[PDB]
Amino acid sequence: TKDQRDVNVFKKVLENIGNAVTQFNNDILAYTGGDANHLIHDGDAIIKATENGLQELGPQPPLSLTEALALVGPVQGVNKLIMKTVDHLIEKKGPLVGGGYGPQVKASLQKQAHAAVTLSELVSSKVPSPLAPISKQLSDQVAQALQKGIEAFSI
Ligand SMILES: CCCCCCCCCCCCCCCC(=O)O
């Protein structure tokens, strides 16, 4: 149906972003010190998925109420993942900063955040009024999580 096809573009974008966050999380968990370039690369892959999502969703028409409701679960999932990943990254501040990666991690998070807020506002512009409050809450979660990271890797 057209209804499933409509939401599927949004779902695929969220899935692609979630996959990139998951890879980043896996490598953060595995990291205890030394070379962090593959980890930094993973961070930049999240930016690319977010940029691809912006490009794919830019001109999408407004979602119906039931279409937009189908995105609540997917977004809550991605958000929980982001929150946990950032927490895990902050838990590795010692070895990252110690290995000289502090500035690069901060810069990656700032760039992630700029793309994330752009996408969160774009998706929020596609949902009808009843979802405006939850869309703001979900947008704020992402922004707040990334900001928590940026602060941790500041001096
Ligand atoms: C019905 C739901 C509407 C919600 C709209 C706002 C939330 C969209 C989520 C955007 C995901 C961007 C995540 C990038 C994370 C990162 O770079 O670390």
Automatic annotation (TrEMBL):
<protein>
    <recommendedName>
        <fullName>Cell wall mannoprotein 1</fullName>
    </recommendedName>
</protein>
<comment type="similarity">
    <text>Belongs to the cell wall mannoprotein 1 family.</text>
</comment>
